[PDB]
Design an enzyme around this catalytic site. Structure first.
Site, PDB file in Angstrom:
ATOM      1  CG  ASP A 144      -2.017   1.044   1.133  1.00 34.49           C
ATOM      2  OD1 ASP A 144      -2.269   1.575   0.032  1.00 34.49           O
ATOM      3  OD2 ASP A 144      -2.607   1.351   2.189  1.00 34.49           O
ATOM      4  NE  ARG A 148      -3.999   6.076   0.714  1.00 37.74           N
ATOM      5  CZ  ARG A 148      -3.675   5.384  -0.374  1.00 37.74           C
ATOM      6  NH1 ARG A 148      -3.215   6.007  -1.457  1.00 37.74           N
ATOM      7  NH2 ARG A 148      -3.808   4.067  -0.380  1.00 37.74           N
ATOM      8  CG  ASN A 149      -0.498   5.174   3.159  1.00 40.36           C
ATOM      9  OD1 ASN A 149      -1.323   5.765   3.856  1.00 40.36           O
ATOM     10  ND2 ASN A 149      -0.817   4.137   2.392  1.00 40.36           N
ATOM     11  CG  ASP A 162      -1.043   2.635   6.052  1.00 39.47           C
ATOM     12  OD1 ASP A 162      -1.072   1.412   5.804  1.00 39.47           O
ATOM     13  OD2 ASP A 162      -2.044   3.277   6.440  1.00 39.47           O
TER      14      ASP A 162
END
Ligand SMILES: [Cs+]
Length: 361
Positions: A144, A148-149, A162
């Site tokens: 993932d 954004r992470n 994350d």
């Protein structure tokens, strides 16, 4: 090893139980999958991010929440978020991490549109690649990886952030925006990972190429306007993301390398880091830009005797070619210029045209 698949064992082994009194909550800074996120102080006291678990949790929800810290505590790298500890014995459940003043990478780049140099963006990419190289050498597949992470501190240091479990794919195919839930979005996931659930460090490399695109565009959305289904079909048919504006040809070359259909042909993260470091240490290699077309949201996929004479407007020589024995193509491509003179092509322009055409065959 297998210390990444047992959340409770990871919590037991790789986290530090912090007492609630040592934590002071100050201000909401975000909304997470499991609850609200605060900036606060941890006991001299140090600023920290405090992830909380919403009240009324399921036992499995508690397990999954603390499992992220169980994973995070196993790592230690300049470009991986640091875990201070967890609160698991008293409610609410909490995860304590180092504070990242500038927050998520994509939001930050959007806020700072055009305010950095290409060299600085490539340095951010180098830091992210260093973190991912560390993760890969630890036999950890992120599954993932997206801007954004990635978190950013005061000194523009980017860190992977994350480390959830029970990660599943986006199921909404008609969607174009961000879907509701802590799902893995289709737009960052490699083809084999979508089709067969084969998440590997190579699929992480694919997602890293997507992150590169994200950075070079200052936080734009991949495959803008397209739907998840359209994205999947495009990737399967050879389409790829287009060149960002003001992007070094080398950086787009590397992105496209990350997006190889066959995962085995993609570069490993060590290769990625080496390439980015070479570019940074010789920044003159970043001035050549890749062609930009502001109309495209995707790049097209790549491509795989009378007729030949008429292709060059010399069909009226056909009978000659037939009379001299040159009745098939296989013998004409093996023809010399003296053969052309002999057969009856006396005019120099015609000789030149036939010769240049022959070169291609
Ligand atoms: Cs512990």
């Amino acid at each position: 090893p297998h210390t990444y698949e047992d959340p409770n064992q990871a919590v037991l082994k790789f986290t530090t139980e912090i007492h609630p009194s040592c934590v002071t909550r100050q201000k909401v800074i975000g909304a997470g999958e499991f609850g609200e996120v605060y900036k606060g102080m941890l006991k001299k006291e140090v600023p920290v991010a405090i992830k909380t678990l919403k009240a009324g949790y399921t036992e499995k929800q508690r397990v999954d929440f603390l499992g992220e810290a169980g994973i995070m505590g196993q790592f230690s790298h300049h470009n991986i978020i640091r875990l201070e500890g967890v609160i698991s014995k008293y409610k609410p459940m909490m995860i304590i991490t180092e504070y990242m003043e500038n927050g998520a990478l994509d939001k930050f780049l959007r806020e700072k549109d055009g305010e950095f140099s290409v060299l600085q963006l490539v340095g951010m990419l180098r830091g992210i690649a260093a973190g991912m190289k560390y993760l890969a050498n630890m036999n950890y597949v992120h599954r993932d990886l997206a801007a954004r992470n990635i978190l950013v501190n005061s000194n523009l240091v980017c860190k992977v952030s994350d480390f959830g479990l029970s990660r599943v794919l986006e199921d909404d195919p008609e969607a174009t925006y961000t879907t509701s839930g802590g799902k893995i979005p289709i737009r960052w996931t490699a083809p084999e990972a979508i089709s067969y659930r084969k998440f590997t460090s190579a699929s992480d490399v694919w997602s890293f190429g997507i992150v590169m695109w994200e950075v070079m565009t200052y936080g734009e959305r991949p495959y803008w306007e397209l739907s998840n289904h359209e994205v999947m079909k495009a990737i399967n048919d050879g389409f790829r993301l287009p060149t960002p504006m003001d992007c070094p040809s080398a950086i787009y070359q590397l992105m496209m390398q990350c997006w190889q259909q066959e995962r085995a042909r993609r570069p490993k993260f060590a290769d990625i880091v080496s390439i980015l470091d070479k570019l940074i240490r010789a920044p003159d290699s970043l001035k050549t830009l890749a062609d930009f077309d502001p109309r495209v949201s995707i790049r097209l996929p790549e491509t795989s005797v009378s007729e030949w004479l008429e292709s060059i407007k010399m069909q009226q020589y056909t009978e000659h070619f037939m009379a001299a024995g040159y009745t098939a193509i296989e013998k004409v491509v093996q023809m010399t210029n003296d053969d052309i003179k002999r057969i009856g092509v006396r005019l120099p322009g015609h000789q030149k045209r036939i010769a240049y055409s022959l070169l291609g065959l």
